Design a binder for this molecule. Structure first.
Ligand code: CLA
Ligand code: CLA
Ligand code: CLA
Ligand code: CLA
Ligand code: CLA
Ligand SMILES: CC1=C(/C=C/C(C)=C/C=C/C(C)=C/C=C/C=C(C)/C=C/C=C(C)/C=C/C2=C(C)CCCC2(C)C)C(C)(C)CCC1
Ligand SMILES: CCCCCCCCCCCCO[C@@H]1O[C@H](CO)[C@@H](O[C@H]2O[C@H](CO)[C@@H](O)[C@H](O)[C@H]2O)[C@H](O)[C@H]1O
Ligand SMILES: CCCCCCCS[C@@H]1O[C@H](CO)[C@@H](O)[C@H](O)[C@H]1O
Lengths: 121, 51
């Protein structure tokens, strides 16, 4: 149960909450009850960029990159509807949240790749 | 005086200044190596070792 002053400057604000190794149970879904996701959090740990080959017929790989815009990358405080469909499946419909972050990663050799890391709509 | 093509003969009986001239030559050569590598790095395209 941490406060802002516990957290500020640590880098912890860009990390999503975690669950213990004990949390391996099952959350019962009642088809009659209405559901929502109160908080969805997404913490990127790796950004890969697909290379652009010269012969255009070679298999292009995703290569590792270096994050250069610091711990500003995570999506959080996202909320939305959690529907229970006819076939028993669930469907999350995003409605709001900090659901984007501009991110710049750098490729080997210096090329910078900005992207809008997002799950909008 | 010394003709132009003999100016460096003044080093023949001056071991200290000979060593200095050699130090300067070595400095120039190391400096060339450094400069050359910097220029190649400023111009080298590493994106395709195949072709
Ligand atoms: C490794 C190189 C080297 C070294 C260690 C020496 C060392 C020496 N020179 Mg020699 N010399 C050299 C090369 C060298 N020289 C070259 C290439 C020339 C033809 C220009 C000469 C012509 C020369 C004369 C006429 C004399 C000496 C003399 C001497 C002695 C006294 C120092 C002096 O006056 O230098 C003077 C030398 C220079 C000022 C070299 C000029 C620099 C050249 C032109 C390049 C310019 C440098 C710049 C950073 C690069 C430009 C890049 C470009 C894209 C613009 C000393 C033993 C003197 C001596 O003792 O006589 C008894 C003397 O009278 N030198
Ligand atoms: C280890 C290499 C080496 C060293 C330390 C020397 C040293 C010497 N040489 Mg010898 N020589 C050499 C190799 C060497 N030489 C080679 C390969 C040749 C055939 C090209 C000669 C042919 C030669 C002749 C015919 C004479 C000498 C003479 C001399 C003495 C006076 C040099 C002088 O004042 O020039 C002064 C030079 C200048 C002021 C300007 C020269 C500009 C040159 C021609 C063009 C630019 C050169 C460029 C900067 C080189 C870059 C590096 C190179 C490796 C690519 C000095 C003991 C003289 C001597 O014995 O006097 C008693 C003399 O008459 N040398
Ligand atoms: C005592 C042992 C000893 C050692 C280790 C050396 C080593 C060397 N001498 Mg020699 N020399 C010696 C005895 C020794 N000498 C004696 C007793 C004489 C008669 C006085 C000579 C006369 C002589 C002449 C005339 C010349 C040499 C040169 C050289 C150098 C040629 C290679 C070079 O420049 O690499 C490049 C250098 C490096 C990669 C870095 C080396 C790091 C330095 C040595 C650390 C500095 C430590 C120390 C405080 C400086 C002086 C060291 C001194 C023992 C050489 C090399 C460092 C030549 C030279 O100096 O050319 C530039 C040269 O012209 N020597
Ligand atoms: C094994 C390698 C090696 C050897 C043995 C030498 C030997 C020599 N270099 Mg060094 N040098 C080297 C590698 C070497 N170099 C490298 C890798 C670089 C970095 C590029 C240099 C950079 C360098 C500079 C900047 C200078 C030297 C000079 C010298 C000479 C000093 C003694 C002298 O007075 O000669 C007297 C001169 C001669 C005997 C004439 C040599 C003529 C050469 C072999 C060909 C010249 C071609 C043409 C006439 C001129 C070039 C074209 C022009 C349009 C640029 C000696 C011949 C100095 C020098 O030449 O002083 C005058 C000098 O200034 N060197
Ligand atoms: C201080 C130590 C040191 C180290 C670890 C290096 C390392 C390097 N140098 Mg640098 N360099 C140094 C000092 C050093 N250098 C100094 C003092 C100079 C000025 C002279 C240079 C000038 C220089 C140039 C101009 C270049 C390098 C280059 C390089 C790279 C290639 C090495 C190579 O291929 O050489 C090969 C070495 C040989 C083939 C040695 C030949 C030895 C002869 C055969 C010996 C003959 C006499 C001997 C006494 C015979 C008897 C031996 C006995 C055992 C029987 C490598 C990263 C290259 C590079 O990649 O640049 C970016 C390059 O072009 N260096
Ligand atoms: C002081 C100091 C420093 C610095 C240094 C430096 C910066 C150096 C540089 C150096 C350099 C930067 C050098 C360079 C050099 C070069 C050279 C030496 C070249 C030569 C050339 C030649 C000789 C050529 C010729 C020719 C021609 C031109 C044409 C063709 C043919 C031939 C090839 C012949 C430091 C900080 C470190 C520390 C200590 C102090
Ligand atoms: C004490 C002495 C130290 C001196 C230091 C000098 C070092 C010089 C050489 C080091 C390597 C330089 O490498 C340098 O990198 C980049 C990317 O390739 C190039 O930069 C070029 O490409 C980039 C990316 O496409 C463009 O944004 C830039 O406008 C363009 O000029 C430089 O043209 C090159 O010279
Ligand atoms: C004395 C050398 C100091 C200069 C070093 C310059 C940085 S290093 C430089 O970085 C660039 C961009 O990432 C690359 O394109 C290039 O290949 C690389 O050599």
């Amino acid at each position: 149960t941490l406060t802002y002053d516990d957290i500020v400057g640590t880098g912890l604000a860009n990390k999503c909450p975690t669950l213990d190794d004990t949390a391996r149970g099952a959350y019962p879904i009642d088809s009659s009850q209405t559901y929502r996701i109160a908080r969805l959090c997404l913490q990127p740990t790796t950004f890969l960029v697909k290379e652009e080959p010269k012969n255009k017929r070679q298999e292009a790989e995703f290569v590792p990159t270096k994050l250069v815009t610091r711990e500003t990358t995570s999506l959080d405080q996202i909320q939305g509807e959690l529907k229970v469909n006819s076939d028993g499946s669930l469907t999350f419909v995003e409605e709001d949240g900090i659901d984007f972050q501009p991110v710049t990663v750098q490729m080997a050799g210096g090329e910078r790749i900005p992207l809008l890391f997002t799950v909008k709509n | 005086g010394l003709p132009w093509y003999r100016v460096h003969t003044v080093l023949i009986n001056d071991p200290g200044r000979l060593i200095a001239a050699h130090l300067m030559h070595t400095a120039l050569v190391a400096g060339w190596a450094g400069s050359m590598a910097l220029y190649e790095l400023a111009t080298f395209d590493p994106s395709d070792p195949v072709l």
